[PDB]
Enzyme design. Structure first.
Site, mmCIF file in Angstrom:
data_model
loop_
_atom_site.group_PDB
_atom_site.id
_atom_site.type_symbol
_atom_site.label_atom_id
_atom_site.label_comp_id
_atom_site.label_asym_id
_atom_site.label_seq_id
_atom_site.Cartn_x
_atom_site.Cartn_y
_atom_site.Cartn_z
ATOM 1 N N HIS B 101 6.940 -5.442 3.614
ATOM 2 C CA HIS B 101 8.307 -5.183 3.182
ATOM 3 C C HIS B 101 8.323 -5.091 1.667
ATOM 4 O O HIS B 101 7.340 -5.438 0.999
ATOM 5 C CB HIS B 101 9.235 -6.304 3.656
ATOM 6 C CG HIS B 101 8.807 -7.646 3.179
ATOM 7 N ND1 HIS B 101 7.785 -8.352 3.775
ATOM 8 C CD2 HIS B 101 9.201 -8.377 2.111
ATOM 9 C CE1 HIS B 101 7.584 -9.471 3.104
ATOM 10 N NE2 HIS B 101 8.436 -9.514 2.095
ATOM 11 N N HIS B 103 10.904 -5.620 -1.851
ATOM 12 C CA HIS B 103 12.077 -6.240 -2.454
ATOM 13 C C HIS B 103 12.762 -5.294 -3.433
ATOM 14 O O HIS B 103 12.091 -4.666 -4.256
ATOM 15 C CB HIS B 103 11.653 -7.463 -3.269
ATOM 16 C CG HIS B 103 11.029 -8.554 -2.472
ATOM 17 N ND1 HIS B 103 11.730 -9.671 -2.079
ATOM 18 C CD2 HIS B 103 9.760 -8.727 -2.028
ATOM 19 C CE1 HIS B 103 10.924 -10.487 -1.420
ATOM 20 N NE2 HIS B 103 9.722 -9.935 -1.371
HETATM 21 N N1 LIG Z 1 15.115 -14.452 8.534
HETATM 22 C C1 LIG Z 1 15.112 -13.898 7.298
HETATM 23 N N2 LIG Z 1 16.079 -13.044 6.876
HETATM 24 C C2 LIG Z 1 16.064 -12.507 5.641
HETATM 25 N N3 LIG Z 1 15.107 -12.768 4.732
HETATM 26 C C3 LIG Z 1 14.081 -13.617 5.027
HETATM 27 C C4 LIG Z 1 14.036 -14.243 6.350
HETATM 28 N N4 LIG Z 1 12.943 -15.029 6.388
HETATM 29 C C5 LIG Z 1 12.328 -14.922 5.188
HETATM 30 N N5 LIG Z 1 13.014 -14.077 4.384
HETATM 31 C C6 LIG Z 1 12.675 -13.694 2.997
HETATM 32 O O1 LIG Z 1 11.539 -12.835 3.002
HETATM 33 C C7 LIG Z 1 10.803 -13.004 1.792
HETATM 34 C C8 LIG Z 1 9.349 -13.199 2.180
HETATM 35 O O2 LIG Z 1 8.545 -13.519 1.029
HETATM 36 P P1 LIG Z 1 7.407 -12.506 0.612
HETATM 37 O O3 LIG Z 1 6.526 -12.377 1.833
HETATM 38 O O4 LIG Z 1 6.813 -13.136 -0.608
HETATM 39 O O5 LIG Z 1 8.129 -11.231 0.274
HETATM 40 C C9 LIG Z 1 11.408 -14.195 1.051
HETATM 41 O O6 LIG Z 1 12.140 -13.766 -0.114
HETATM 42 C C10 LIG Z 1 12.302 -14.851 2.097
HETATM 43 O O7 LIG Z 1 13.459 -15.524 1.570
#
Ligand SMILES: Nc1ncnc2c1ncn2[C@@H]1O[C@H](COP(=O)(O)O)[C@@H](O)[C@H]1O
Ligand SMILES: Nc1ncnc2c1ncn2[C@@H]1O[C@H](COP(=O)(O)O)[C@@H](O)[C@H]1O
Ligand SMILES: [Zn+2]
Ligand SMILES: [Zn+2]
Lengths: 139, 139
Positions: B101, B103
């Protein structure tokens, strides 16, 4: 453009860079202030500034090149276990060179990096070029 | 996949999200731990983990969608002056959800952000959806 923009100047061969990747539309060079060894900038050869004026096809391609460099770093003698990919869109997002570009910052397990000088950038460049050449051979 | 991966579950409509964008291949949702209001995740509907196993066409498209959301934030009632785009490739690069994903973190002049709770995420979602709808109308 070459006389007014440092990234245009590098693309034109009018200013120095350690180059690690090039195709028809993009140039990958080492950052001069690296967060980690092998910190690379992917620079579209056409000058646009940010996400408001860069064609989506260019942003898309920049990301694809960034991926290729990330994959290379992971198989390279710089020993990357991962990478941070970044685009800093606008001054508010830390943009300081106003020619759109994408960062590939190699990361290593337990490197304790927090978001800047490489002891041998030429070596880092050579290692990334060798890894990119190896990915090319495998395809 | 839906029962073992939270991002697959959200894509399948089996887990909650504030959704702000969707097309055939990608879903944009609000992060549950936002760095800033409107902090959005662009999630390919197909599960792959990182830059080693995600097709370049998917990375490319993810970036293009991220750009669209960035542009929307800049014209939105969240008042973005810029954006940080990021992909965290691998655990060493801070990856914690192992479904690839991207950001989009909206930024504002003088926000003093350093790299996490939104007082009204539903409002942030509504503002981004309205801005995206407006960009769509203009095209
Ligand atoms: N159920 C969820 N809904 C929305 N965002 C999420 C959820 N679970 C985790 N995240 C976010 O996904 C991101 C994962 O971290 P990263 O893998 O470093 O991008 C973090 O910013 C989390 O806050
Ligand atoms: N002449 C140059 N060669 C290589 N990298 C540069 C040069 N000038 C600036 N940079 C880098 O480009 C980046 C620009 O910052 P930003 O606009 O936030 O991505 C910084 O990491 C700088 O160290
Ligand atoms: Zn330029
Ligand atoms: Zn998944």
């Amino acid at each position: 453009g070459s006389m007014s923009c440092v990234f245009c100047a590098i693309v034109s061969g009018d200013a120095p860079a350690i180059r690690i990747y090039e195709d028809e539309n993009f140039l990958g060079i080492l950052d001069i202030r690296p967060f980690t060894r092998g910190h690379t900038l992917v620079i579209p050869k056409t000058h646009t500034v940010d996400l408001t004026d860069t064609p989506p096809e260019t942003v898309a391609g920049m990301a694809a090149v960034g991926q290729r460099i990330a994959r290379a770093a992971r198989e390279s003698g710089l020993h990357a276990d991962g990478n941070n990919i970044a685009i800093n869109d606008g001054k508010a997002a830390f943009q300081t060179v106003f020619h759109i570009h994408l960062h590939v910052v190699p990361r290593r397990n337990g490197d304790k990096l927090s978001f800047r000088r490489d002891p041998d950038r030429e070596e880092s460049g050579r290692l990334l070029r060798a890894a990119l050449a190896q990915l090319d051979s495998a395809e």
